[PDB]
Amino acid sequence: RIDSSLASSAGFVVAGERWYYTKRHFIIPRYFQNWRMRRRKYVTGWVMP
Amino acid sequence: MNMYKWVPESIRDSGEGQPSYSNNGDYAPSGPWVAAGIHTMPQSLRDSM
Amino acid sequence: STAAVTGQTGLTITYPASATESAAIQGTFGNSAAIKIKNQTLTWTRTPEGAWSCATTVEAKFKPAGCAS
Amino acid sequence: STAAVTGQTGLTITYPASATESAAIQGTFGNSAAIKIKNQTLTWTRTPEGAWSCATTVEAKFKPAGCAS
Amino acid sequence: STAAVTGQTGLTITYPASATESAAIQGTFGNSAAIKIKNQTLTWTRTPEGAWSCATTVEAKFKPAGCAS
Amino acid sequence: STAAVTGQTGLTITYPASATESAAIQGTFGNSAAIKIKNQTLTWTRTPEGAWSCATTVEAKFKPAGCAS
Amino acid sequence: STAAVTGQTGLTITYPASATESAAIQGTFGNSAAIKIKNQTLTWTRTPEGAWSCATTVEAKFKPAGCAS
Amino acid sequence: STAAVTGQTGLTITYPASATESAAIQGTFGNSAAIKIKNQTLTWTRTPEGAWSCATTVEAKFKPAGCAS
Amino acid sequence: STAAVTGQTGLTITYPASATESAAIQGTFGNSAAIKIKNQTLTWTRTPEGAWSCATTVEAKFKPAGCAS
Amino acid sequence: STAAVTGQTGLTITYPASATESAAIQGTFGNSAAIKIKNQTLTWTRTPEGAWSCATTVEAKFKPAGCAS
Amino acid sequence: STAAVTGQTGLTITYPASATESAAIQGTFGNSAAIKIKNQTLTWTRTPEGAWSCATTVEAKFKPAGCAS
Amino acid sequence: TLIELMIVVAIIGILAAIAIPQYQNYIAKSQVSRVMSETGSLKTVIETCILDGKTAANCELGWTNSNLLG
Amino acid sequence: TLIELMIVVAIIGILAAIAIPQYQNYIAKSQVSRVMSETGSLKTVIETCILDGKTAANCELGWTNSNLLG
Amino acid sequence: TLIELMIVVAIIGILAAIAIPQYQNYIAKSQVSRVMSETGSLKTVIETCILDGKTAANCELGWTNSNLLG
């Protein structure tokens, strides 16, 4: 979950950490952890075309 | 070469988002807040981010 | 007293039907309650992820610290 | 009961009929299983060479280390 | 909510990545705390050998019997 | 009304902002008060420890038993 | 996997090349293993006469009766 | 002071002997109680299913909100 | 002690003397058991085929998940 | 303010040291007390059993119903 | 912490060095314990056959149902 | 004032009427749960004796008396 | 005193506000752990059946119905 | 009822101060035993290979990947 920032701040109204998607309610990307992500191991090798 | 790499397009809206309604009822960065359910945000903004 | 129908008309239980529903226990004041809160509601919402939290529609001053949203 | 048909509806056995066909034992959660993990399946698949492994579709935090994909 | 990052500001966790470093759960009072205890801290000390201990920076009187050292 | 702002100009309360200062409730006589005691004050101060005491600037004869300096 | 090379890097096989040297099956913990014994090894040594015995680098409290040498 | 007999005769304990009978804890006013309620009794009964309820013979205008029955 | 006779009066063992009769391990509550379930029974029955199952005479409220029969 | 050393001389604490001694909290009147009860004392004693009782040397007509002993 | 040498003075372990003598785990209250039970002891004894039982030296009202003997 | 003491008495009465959440169900399920483990703990003894062919008296039960008589 | 009774109200407010440790994650893990042991026990009979070459209908399964639907 | 809520807090404080057993040895001892079985199971393969005279490369190993890396 980790991160939710580096998103589209458009629409949100930034008040410090607060991003007011409404006049009354806000969000904090630091803890807006609705985002599950994924990472994988990768074995790689450089190639010459 | 083993290499941990993040996996894009495998992320999901897990629903952990907890938007907060500032009890001040305005864009004040301070003041008490009401951590609400993820239902209060437009899904379009969620998809954009 | 069962979850579907309880023994008190002021107590209602929201029983989830699948893995995506959010449980809620709602209690409407009355009888011996104050006149001001004769029809207010106190709800404990349970997110499907396993998070319990409280909410109520009554004044913020009258909310306790735990149910202070 | 048998590999072809079992006495339980939620238990299915994928019995191979050839030397190059794998074997799988899959069970689907239900009845007294958790509502959150309901209808999910955990399968123990067997390679034709005799290697046994476990796989499941339950959430990452609910997967035991012995069946982690 | 993971060990690396938590959903609350007041809680931080030192995850032991080796066999020679200790684990600790740090919870810092705040939000709705008592004014005297706006900034005190208590930790759950987990020794690498398997021992759990508790310590606090609060005054002596506020210390419960389980965290007197 | 509120600790920060009150509905009567004759009542003031000093609300602490940290743990190293004291609280106080102060009230000044007026209107229906006697002319001799028209402009002194009676204060209820709370120490950082949390101890409540009463003090007043009125003459010794007008002081109650519990507010004897 | 074979004796010369195995499919697990934590599993090591020391196959003798003559009739005078000894064989060894050495296995190194990790991944799902405990943090304290994350880098320890358990090895099975076989004397040229055909006798099997075990040794381990873990602490005494974790050594079983089999390898408590 | 046991359930069979109390320290004072003004408090009585009805201890159930089987699972199909209800218990009762009855207390009678007196001594330093009001003269007009010198012989009234306050009793607590427990249903066999495990429900506790209160009853008393005092007039309605003296009854608390919890024993208005 | 033995299957023929046990060391506790509330524990009884039904041993199968042949291949066409079932076995029963019946335990009767009491002593420190609750008064409501003082005289109920819980039993393990095993078919001659070797299949074990649970049965009890207690109410459905008190029945565990594995003995809902 | 501790049990061993009270803040004022008018209050004395009998802190038992073993399981056979009794705790007592004695408060001697004075200062702003009435001249007649200037040297009277009031004590709260606790038996090792865990029972609290009240005793006072003030006149019978000044004894409330709480400490009618 | 060994059976012969434990890490706490309030814990006593009797290790059977022969097949005919019993094992016992003795724990004496104190320090943070209640003053009434300041010097009492609670013991767990094991017969050489492998049967465990609990004995306690506190009063019967302090004895739970498990160590009521 | 008399009104301030009446608030205290009413709060005490309000507190004294807290609902009791039927604690019988919780312990009874747990008490059966402990007995549930005891009865199943002897299955291994019985299953081996039946398969080994021991008689009822020839089967040694490692049973310790339970305070719940189960 | 009113100050004493108000404090008791706050304590109940504080005490009842304890955080839930999300026991749903704890329970679900055990059920999965239980199931895989049951399905793990079916490996030996299937392995022995395959190594003998018997058909699926001929492979006798000593499976017992599980309350979690296996 | 100020004194009553103290017993509630005191019991919780006592219960929160329960001695947590050192469970680390249990898992580590059990984990090595799983390696004990896994490592010793290849002795038959190793012993058969040595007695037949095959080399390290000629010794077929029916090893399965272990989550503990042992």
Side-chain angles (χ1 to χ4, degrees):
Chain A
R1 299 297 185 285
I2 304 175
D3 171 27
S4 300
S5 76
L6 283 72
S8 171
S9 67
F12 294 104
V13 178
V14 182
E17 64 179 0
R18 314 188 160 172
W19 292 353
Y20 282 89
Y21 61 104
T22 70
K23 298 288 181 183
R24 295 179 66 250
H25 296 51
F26 67 85
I27 65 150
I28 293 156
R30 174 67 172 75
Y31 300 105
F32 191 73
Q33 298 184 331
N34 64 322
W35 303 116
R36 157 179 291 171
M37 283 74 74
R38 184 161 292 166
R39 81 200 187 201
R40 269 156 73 84
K41 191 185 166 185
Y42 282 84
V43 167
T44 178
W46 295 91
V47 73
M48 294 299 291
Chain B
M1 186 66 204
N2 56 4
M3 187 66 203
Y4 278 107
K5 311 180 174 177
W6 218 259
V7 177
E9 69 268 12
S10 294
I11 77 164
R12 303 291 170 269
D13 184 8
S14 54
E16 316 306 313
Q18 288 179 297
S20 281
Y21 152 67
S22 171
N23 276 344
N24 299 355
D26 63 358
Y27 297 113
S30 185
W33 39 267
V34 166
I38 195 166
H39 66 288
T40 56
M41 283 73 74
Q43 305 313 320
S44 70
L45 196 52
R46 187 271 317 279
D47 292 348
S48 66
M49 65 182 179
Chain C
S1 59
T2 75
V5 162
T6 69
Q8 185 151 33
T9 182
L11 176 80
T12 60
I13 308 292
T14 304
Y15 202 81
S18 164
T20 74
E21 209 276 335
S22 66
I25 299 169
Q26 163 157 288
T28 48
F29 304 96
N31 195 7
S32 298
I35 292 177
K36 72 177 76 67
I37 58 172
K38 191 64 64 67
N39 282 115
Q40 310 297 326
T41 75
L42 188 149
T43 177
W44 278 92
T45 184
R46 169 56 153 70
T47 80
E49 292 87 2
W52 276 103
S53 56
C54 168
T56 178
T57 77
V58 65
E59 319 210 316
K61 197 206 157 173
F62 182 55
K63 300 184 194 186
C67 279
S69 294
Chain D
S1 81
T2 70
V5 64
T6 78
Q8 192 150 34
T9 62
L11 181 76
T12 59
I13 311 290
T14 306
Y15 207 80
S18 66
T20 70
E21 172 36 33
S22 62
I25 302 173
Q26 173 157 247
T28 311
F29 299 106
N31 283 325
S32 71
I35 285 162
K36 181 83 168 71
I37 70 168
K38 198 148 285 189
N39 288 314
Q40 312 288 345
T41 65
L42 183 137
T43 177
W44 279 89
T45 184
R46 165 203 188 270
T47 79
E49 303 84 0
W52 281 98
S53 63
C54 166
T56 184
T57 75
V58 67
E59 294 198 2
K61 45 176 187 204
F62 307 139
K63 284 197 185 186
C67 287
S69 65
Chain E
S1 66
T2 77
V5 62
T6 71
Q8 185 153 30
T9 64
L11 281 81
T12 184
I13 294 169
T14 305
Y15 182 76
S18 75
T20 184
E21 51 196 44
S22 46
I25 309 161
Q26 193 34 71
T28 58
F29 299 99
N31 198 8
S32 287
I35 282 183
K36 197 59 159 54
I37 299 314
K38 299 289 94 176
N39 264 311
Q40 312 294 334
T41 75
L42 183 141
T43 179
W44 276 98
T45 311
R46 170 60 163 75
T47 80
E49 274 60 40
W52 273 105
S53 51
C54 167
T56 177
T57 76
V58 300
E59 293 181 354
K61 39 176 188 180
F62 307 143
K63 292 193 188 198
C67 302
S69 296
Chain F
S1 87
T2 77
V5 65
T6 75
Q8 197 157 17
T9 78
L11 175 79
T12 65
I13 293 174
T14 301
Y15 192 82
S18 81
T20 185
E21 72 272 16
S22 81
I25 303 158
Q26 180 170 242
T28 307
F29 301 88
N31 184 347
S32 290
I35 289 171
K36 184 73 181 173
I37 59 169
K38 205 57 173 281
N39 272 311
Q40 297 81 8
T41 181
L42 188 151
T43 186
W44 281 91
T45 176
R46 172 196 190 268
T47 61
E49 283 58 41
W52 284 95
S53 62
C54 165
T56 179
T57 312
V58 306
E59 299 325 289
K61 182 136 171 81
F62 306 122
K63 297 193 189 181
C67 301
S69 297
Chain G
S1 58
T2 187
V5 65
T6 70
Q8 197 153 29
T9 48
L11 184 73
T12 308
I13 317 290
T14 305
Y15 201 82
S18 71
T20 57
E21 62 206 36
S22 67
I25 309 163
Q26 178 164 238
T28 310
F29 308 103
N31 191 9
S32 298
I35 301 184
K36 184 84 160 204
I37 57 174
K38 191 65 81 142
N39 58 5
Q40 306 303 320
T41 64
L42 181 134
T43 179
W44 263 93
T45 182
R46 168 197 187 265
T47 79
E49 322 300 332
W52 283 93
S53 56
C54 167
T56 178
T57 75
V58 298
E59 313 212 335
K61 36 177 200 179
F62 311 140
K63 290 193 184 188
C67 304
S69 65
Chain H
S1 60
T2 72
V5 65
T6 56
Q8 62 191 129
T9 190
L11 173 84
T12 67
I13 311 292
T14 298
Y15 203 84
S18 66
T20 60
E21 52 192 45
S22 49
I25 299 157
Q26 168 157 302
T28 311
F29 302 99
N31 198 3
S32 295
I35 294 181
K36 298 193 198 110
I37 60 173
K38 71 184 186 296
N39 44 64
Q40 316 298 324
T41 70
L42 192 142
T43 187
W44 264 95
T45 185
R46 170 202 188 264
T47 77
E49 278 58 51
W52 281 97
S53 65
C54 169
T56 180
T57 72
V58 194
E59 318 185 353
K61 76 207 209 181
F62 307 141
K63 284 196 186 179
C67 302
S69 281
Chain I
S1 86
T2 71
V5 60
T6 72
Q8 196 149 29
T9 58
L11 179 81
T12 62
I13 300 284
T14 301
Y15 200 83
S18 75
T20 63
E21 61 204 51
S22 46
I25 303 164
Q26 176 171 260
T28 311
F29 302 104
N31 192 5
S32 296
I35 299 178
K36 191 69 184 294
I37 61 161
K38 188 65 72 174
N39 267 302
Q40 314 297 331
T41 75
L42 188 153
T43 179
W44 267 99
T45 182
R46 167 198 190 265
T47 78
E49 290 89 4
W52 284 92
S53 83
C54 179
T56 177
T57 68
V58 76
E59 310 206 340
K61 283 184 324 171
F62 299 161
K63 280 198 185 184
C67 305
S69 297
Chain J
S1 177
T2 181
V5 178
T6 57
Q8 70 196 106
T9 77
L11 179 73
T12 302
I13 307 294
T14 300
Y15 199 87
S18 85
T20 61
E21 317 178 78
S22 85
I25 299 160
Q26 171 164 225
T28 310
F29 296 96
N31 194 6
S32 285
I35 294 177
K36 64 181 182 295
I37 61 168
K38 184 69 71 177
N39 272 295
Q40 305 299 326
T41 177
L42 186 139
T43 307
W44 269 98
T45 182
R46 167 202 193 272
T47 80
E49 178 69 27
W52 280 95
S53 59
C54 179
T56 316
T57 68
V58 70
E59 273 186 84
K61 32 178 204 177
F62 312 141
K63 288 187 183 179
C67 308
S69 296
Chain K
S1 66
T2 74
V5 179
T6 65
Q8 187 156 25
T9 55
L11 180 75
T12 307
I13 302 287
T14 305
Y15 199 88
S18 76
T20 59
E21 65 183 1
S22 56
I25 301 170
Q26 177 53 271
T28 309
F29 299 96
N31 195 5
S32 289
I35 303 178
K36 194 64 166 50
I37 58 170
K38 186 60 82 143
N39 273 304
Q40 314 301 326
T41 65
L42 181 138
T43 179
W44 277 90
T45 179
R46 163 204 187 265
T47 81
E49 268 65 40
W52 274 101
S53 64
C54 181
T56 305
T57 66
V58 304
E59 323 198 335
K61 64 183 181 180
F62 303 153
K63 286 193 187 186
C67 313
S69 84
Chain L
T1 60
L2 193 46
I3 185 166
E4 72 195 59
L5 268 298
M6 211 45 88
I7 300 302
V8 165
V9 168
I11 297 169
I12 294 168
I14 282 162
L15 285 192
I18 178 151
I20 314 303
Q22 205 166 135
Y23 287 118
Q24 185 53 284
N25 291 318
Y26 313 130
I27 60 159
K29 186 169 276 200
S30 67
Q31 283 180 354
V32 170
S33 300
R34 177 67 194 90
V35 160
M36 202 45 237
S37 187
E38 283 167 17
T39 57
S41 70
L42 285 184
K43 298 206 302 282
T44 313
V45 182
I46 297 300
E47 196 73 38
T48 301
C49 289
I50 291 166
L51 293 173
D52 192 287
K54 300 184 189 242
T55 67
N58 205 353
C59 189
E60 202 64 48
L61 259 61
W63 172 252
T64 302
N65 295 295
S66 182
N67 64 323
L68 301 172
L69 287 180
Chain M
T1 59
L2 197 71
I3 183 166
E4 175 158 314
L5 276 296
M6 157 280 308
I7 284 289
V8 168
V9 172
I11 302 152
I12 297 165
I14 285 162
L15 281 193
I18 191 166
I20 301 300
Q22 193 171 126
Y23 294 114
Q24 175 168 272
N25 301 7
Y26 294 142
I27 284 283
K29 185 176 180 180
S30 53
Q31 315 168 251
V32 179
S33 300
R34 179 179 179 272
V35 163
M36 51 86 88
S37 178
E38 314 175 328
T39 56
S41 72
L42 279 179
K43 283 187 280 144
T44 303
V45 291
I46 299 298
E47 197 75 21
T48 302
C49 281
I50 289 163
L51 295 173
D52 284 329
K54 63 203 297 184
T55 69
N58 286 341
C59 179
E60 203 62 41
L61 260 69
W63 166 252
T64 305
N65 270 40
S66 181
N67 212 334
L68 309 173
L69 258 181
Chain N
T1 60
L2 190 57
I3 192 184
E4 183 178 1
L5 275 297
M6 165 256 290
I7 300 292
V8 166
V9 168
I11 291 170
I12 292 169
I14 286 164
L15 286 190
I18 188 167
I20 296 298
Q22 192 259 336
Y23 294 116
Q24 184 170 249
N25 298 5
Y26 299 148
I27 297 294
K29 187 180 271 205
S30 68
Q31 188 274 151
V32 170
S33 302
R34 301 138 180 160
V35 168
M36 186 66 203
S37 178
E38 288 170 10
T39 306
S41 44
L42 296 188
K43 296 198 301 282
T44 309
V45 183
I46 296 304
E47 202 65 48
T48 43
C49 284
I50 289 168
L51 293 172
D52 206 302
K54 324 176 146 180
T55 63
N58 201 5
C59 182
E60 189 34 70
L61 188 65
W63 174 253
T64 312
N65 189 359
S66 179
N67 67 318
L68 305 167
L69 288 183

